Amino acid sequence: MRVAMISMHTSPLQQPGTGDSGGMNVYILSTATELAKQGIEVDIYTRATRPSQGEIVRVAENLRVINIAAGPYEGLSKEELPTQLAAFTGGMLSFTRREKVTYDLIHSHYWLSGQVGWLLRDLWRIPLIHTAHTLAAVDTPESEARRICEQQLVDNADVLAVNTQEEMQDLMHHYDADPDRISVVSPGADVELYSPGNDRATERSRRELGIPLHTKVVAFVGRLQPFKGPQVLIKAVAALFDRDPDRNLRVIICGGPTYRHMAEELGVEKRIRFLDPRPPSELVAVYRAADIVAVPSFNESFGLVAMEAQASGTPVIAARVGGLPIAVAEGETGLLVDGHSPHAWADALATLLDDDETRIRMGEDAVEHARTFSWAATAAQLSSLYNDAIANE
Amino acid sequence: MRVAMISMHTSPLQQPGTGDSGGMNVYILSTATELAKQGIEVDIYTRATRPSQGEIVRVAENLRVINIAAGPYEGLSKEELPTQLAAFTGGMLSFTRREKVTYDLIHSHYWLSGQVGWLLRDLWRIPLIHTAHTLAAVDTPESEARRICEQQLVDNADVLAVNTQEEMQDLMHHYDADPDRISVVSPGADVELYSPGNDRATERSRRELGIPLHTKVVAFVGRLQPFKGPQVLIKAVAALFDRDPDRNLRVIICGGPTYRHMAEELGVEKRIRFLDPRPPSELVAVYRAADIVAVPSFNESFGLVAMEAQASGTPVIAARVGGLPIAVAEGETGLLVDGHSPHAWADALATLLDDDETRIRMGEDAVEHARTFSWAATAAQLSSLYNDAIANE
Numbered sequence A, B: 001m002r003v004a005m006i007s008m009h010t011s012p013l014q015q016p017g018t019g020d021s022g023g024m025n026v027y028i029l030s031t032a033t034e035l036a037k038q039g040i041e042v043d044i045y046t047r048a049t050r051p052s053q054g055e056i057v058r059v060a061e062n063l064r065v066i067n068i069a070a071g072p073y074e075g076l077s078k079e080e081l082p083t084q085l086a087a088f089t090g091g092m093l094s095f096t097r098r099e100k101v102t103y104d105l106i107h108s109h110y111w112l113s114g115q116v117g118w119l120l121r122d123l124w125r126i127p128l129i130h131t132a133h134t135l136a137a138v139d140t141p142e143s144e145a146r147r148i149c150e151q152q153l154v155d156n157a158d159v160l161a162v163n164t165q166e167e168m169q170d171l172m173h174h175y176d177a178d179p180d181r182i183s184v185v186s187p188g189a190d191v192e193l194y195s196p197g198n199d200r201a202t203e204r205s206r207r208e209l210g211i212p213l214h215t216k217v218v219a220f221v222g223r224l225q226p227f228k229g230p231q232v233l234i235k236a237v238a239a240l241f242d243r244d245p246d247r248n249l250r251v252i253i254c255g256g257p258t259y260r261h262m263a264e265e266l267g268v269e270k271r272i273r274f275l276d277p278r279p280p281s282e283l284v285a286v287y288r289a290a291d292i293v294a295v296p297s298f299n300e301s302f303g304l305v306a307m308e309a310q311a312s313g314t315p316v317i318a319a320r321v322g323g324l325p326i327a328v329a330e331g332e333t334g335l336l337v338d339g340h341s342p343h344a345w346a347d348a349l350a351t352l353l354d355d356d357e358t359r360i361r362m363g364e365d366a367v368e369h370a371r372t373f374s375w376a377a378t379a380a381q382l383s384s385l386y387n388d389a390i391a392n393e
Ligand SMILES: O=c1ccn([C@@H]2O[C@H](COP(=O)(O)OP(=O)(O)O)[C@@H](O)[C@H]2O)c(=O)[nH]1
Pocket: A015, A016, A017, A018, A021, A022, A023, A024, A026, A221, A222, A223, A254, A255, A276, A277, A278, A279, A280, A283, A300, A301, A302, A303, A304, A305, A306, A308
């Protein structure tokens, strides 16, 4: 079996969580890697942005990323990429003609890639599996246009792969999706890498990151974009220091795009530390160093960060949003906050900070909870999904 | 020979000059009709917007318009149509598969259609002839994205068909075009329909349009969009009435999108009359009724309106912009104004209004000048262009 994955506007090779790269990229790369271990051949198609990479990047046996030239390597934001939809498709057409490569199935990611997938699937006469990741309908002409495209894929994809049951309901309510075409594919997290793991490990991580050993740490991990609510953490941390100015608390934000500006405007610069984004092998230390990972998203998911933090034995305080209530077991492995008021977040942070016995237990339980998430699981589900889709054409 | 013309965002069947429909539509329809008379089979592909029309409209022998469904019949402006580029292409792919129809050549119109054309031409292995009509480079992310697409077509189309030599220079300067790929195809105007024509014809037209027989008329014809400068006519007419409040002058604007609001704000409502847009068989009367057609474009062309007015024996006062200096023979069949100051336009209008002998002569000469423009000409040039393109593949 050879699968063409389409990830047009962002590449699985781009460092997550700056820029346009986040959980979807790690989702695409992680599943693809697992599929490739299982002997399924995957090529991930993406728009060429870094020419030093070449056209074909060989990631592992059975796994390639294909960098397709379509418009300039830069100066084209995600909002303008619809203008490249036909060029990118044409780019994929030539590459496959040149390489004489044939696919059994296409799995598209995000509405841009789905529009490409929809054309390719009719041309190649093979099934299209589509994963939305996020959706307009969950108020401008641009969002209206995206919604319309998202509606087209709902109506035309052979299988709509969603990441939770809540997204399935979302598809059915906001897009009138046929429930027979929807399939829940639960996501994973790299649970071997993100792990507690060892009695001295938290403190080893603190030494490595230059964090004081006797202090409480809240971490935010991910893209620094308003929809992710890092401003909520910063504002809540300000409130905490209004209540008790010498609270033993340091914050790490880790993190690519000003939020430092907001932090100094609120007087909390010296207790907040902004870390550059780093590969998973290095992120572990942020998770382990942390007593609490705060994830104040306005929109989401699953919530890969919530899962990775859990896997690493660190309780999460999450917004009651997207996949987060499924990623976090409320009251057992963390807390869920309603809304994004600094006051409500201060409350939730304070209750986990000041109750050691509870917080420690959540962290230990978070590990047990997170082992239910299993990229290799995820791929096993996709593999079946692919086999059925192929069998029914 | 069977040619697929692509006109994605606007249909040759849409009434010119409201909305998104103007000279390009009449260019597409007029050439296609002439090509079809010459035994060349043309299908014009467009986005479906009026379902009462059906999928295939049979216009004449050898001429069809194909309405391709891609996104909703409405609620999608031209700016958001890039989001439909892959759906529209996919739509064309299915239609041709269903109908088992094969093309010798593609002639695309406007950058959207060219992006579709570029993908189709590699797939079908046939030449792409592209006509830009207008160009971004002749300052927002959206215009930057369009420019980039326009640059891609310059680099990839087999023939760049332009409408004047000035556009050729524009292609070469702003887009680094290869001069070997550029071919000037001079446009036409329906010179039999738009004609003087008969000694009592001007006055017959005035009776028909309810215009007083003893008055001077300036007409503006075309889409009421700021880039067309109808505001310039309105402001200039205001200036004329500041200089001499009982000047014998009436204005007809004809015309789809407020400019009536501007007119009342300036005190000139009662001398200005706004006409709904009408088919060519009815527009003739506007041209004949007129003593002067003012065309204060900020961007253009050729300038089909300038040509049609000339053909109908009516002098033109045009902005020195786009194709207008070629469409109008300065000092012989009309005047050219530099810039768009009401004062400069008042001057130019006043000199043609108050000098009958000159104006009458220009009108007579305008006829002789306009017969150099010849849709059947235009098509003869395209026909050769197509034959060469086919011969070189
Ligand atoms: O320094 C960093 C911070 C972020 N991440 C990754 O970025 C992803 C962000 O996931 P999240 O679900 O929060 O982002 P979103 O779903 O909003 O795209 C996670 O997988 C992190 O491992 C990373 O690799 N390095």
